[model samples]
Target chain A: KITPEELERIAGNFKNAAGEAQSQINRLEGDINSLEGQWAGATQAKFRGEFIQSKQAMQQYIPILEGISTDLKRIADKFR
Target chain B: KITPEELERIAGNFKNAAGEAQSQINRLEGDINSLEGQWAGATQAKFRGEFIQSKQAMQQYIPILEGISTDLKRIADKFR
Candidate 1:
């Protein structure tokens, strides 16, 4: 039999990990934007296009992480 | 003028971020495994199924992250 504490602990860990990933993504976007402003040309264009694809992949990831984190927390609460 | 240093900085940050995420995910999976070992029954079964979906979503993410990290590092090297 698991305690509420362990459930909550896992929930919290997931939530915090999701938040940290979100934070880095935010910074990554900002850095990309900064580079965009300063650099221009076909290579920059190519980088932009490639980076957009990369960014879109992350767009899918964060939501999934957030969803699991929230669902886990809710489950934890139910057990409490 | 943008420098190779800045390029490398962005590359390094993304790599580290990706690695950090991978680390958290490793821990998350272990936690889930621990939970699975301890808890059983219908609810545990349900959680296990749901968690598998979550895990699959991440399987799509880490490769994208590693791909970009490697690409960015290559780009940074090209500029040096």
Candidate 2:
């Protein structure tokens, strides 16, 4: 069985990683959103679907990451 | 313009990161799935929604990451 300290540390790591991942995702989203506004014609056409899909994906993914982070913390608390 | 080699390298890194992220997500999914089966009553209830959400999030996110991976490759090729 995993030790309490180990579980707690792992939980912390998960939260940290989730935060960093969110930051990365946010930056990418910002870049894509900017491109969405600026580019036009064929250039815009090429990226429009890709940008939309990426945004949609991240929207789903982020909440799950948050849920996972919360669950990790709960598990760690149980160990405590 | 960015160098072809640099864009290529960045694209490679993005692909690598996406692969690793997917792997990590897979392991977490497996663990949650197993727990979904084994845990009972309140413990199970607490985790069920999280597991479901995580699965849903990954379903959306993975495709976006793949799209991003393809876009990166395309950008790199343009530089080439």
Candidate 3:
């Protein structure tokens, strides 16, 4: 069985992972968004549509990471 | 403006990230599951509830990553 100390450390790692993921996604999103200014017509239209879809997907995922991180922290708290 | 080649590479990176995140989550989930066998009564009940929440959150998140991955690939394809 895992100890409370290990559980707490694991929770911390999850939180760190969530934080890192948020930063990376934010950077990627910026990259995706900046393309909007440089293109027009058909490619731009498609890019806009696809980028929105991609953004929506990213939006859905990040919160899950945070939820998991919170869940781990709660479990750690109880285990302690 | 980003080149199509770079877009392809970026899409690949996203896919790789999505895959990595999945594997790590799976490992973490197993760790969470193994706890069930060793506990009893109230702590166990709370752990079960929280674990379900964690698992449900994970389930919700992973598909989003895959959706993002697919969306990036399509965008790269269009950019090419």
Candidate 4:
């Protein structure tokens, strides 16, 4: 399977990678929220643009996606 | 070995830490998507919260993350 399942097994493990990337996403999302709030307050397209960028950043996680389905399944076991 | 496996064995059953964390990242993504959609729809920042900020703050280089195994292998081999 050239799918995510295959990818996760292939990728092995990257605790540092996952932690670092998560931190980056968290920071960008905050900036976007600030921008989004500013846009909402002033009806500014620029802010909206920033918001869009944040959204795009979210869309492109760039890490840990290939095995998302498998990832969640693994995580879900913890909750369930 | 201070490893995830040891942790998993202590974790007694999480399978992979990478997997669960990846899943958590996925759900947070929706917030970013919604905010992006809002900015796209009418440029609103009112909906920004845990979802938006968290995602924007994190998730940028997801590919490198998914490629952790291969990337680490290449990195290790590079040194060796």
**Candidate lDDT values, in order:** 0.48, 0.43, 0.49, 0.38
In candidate 4 chain B, what residue range of length 10 has the lowest lDDT sum?
B6-15
The alpha-carbon root-mean-square deviation between model 3 and the true structure, to one decimal in Å, is: 9.3
- TM-score, chain B, model 4, is 0.40
Candidate order by lDDT, highest to lowest? Answer: 3, 1, 2, 4
Put down candidate 1 lDDT per residue, A1-80, tens digits, no spaces: 44323544544554454444545554555555566555643365446554555444454454544454454444333332
What does DockQ give for each predicted structure?
A: 0.07, 0.05, 0.09, 0.04
Better of 2 and 3 by lDDT: 3
> What is the per-residue lDDT of model 3 for residues A13-51, given as tens digits with 9 covering 90 to 100?
543544445445445545654564564433655465555
lDDT (10s digit) by residue, model 2, range A12-49: 44434444454454445345444535465666556545
Runs in model 4 lying further than 4 Å from the true structure: A1-13, A36-38, A60-66, A69-80, B1-19, B22-63, B66-80
- For every model shown, what is its TM-score relative to the native structure? 0.40, 0.39, 0.39, 0.34
Docking class of 4: incorrect
Question: What's the i-RMS of each model?
Answer: 8.8, 11.2, 9.0, 17.9
The worst-scoring run of ten residues by lDDT in candidate 1 chain A lies at A71-80
Q: B1-80 in candidate 3: lDDT tens per residue?
A: 44433443544454445444544554554566466466565655656655555545544554544454455455445434
Tell me model 2's lDDT, rounded to 2 decimals: 0.43
Give me the runs in candidate 1 sitting further than 4 Å from their true place. A1-80, B69-80
Question: What's the number of clashes in each of the models?
Answer: 0, 0, 0, 21
What's the DockQ of model 3? 0.09
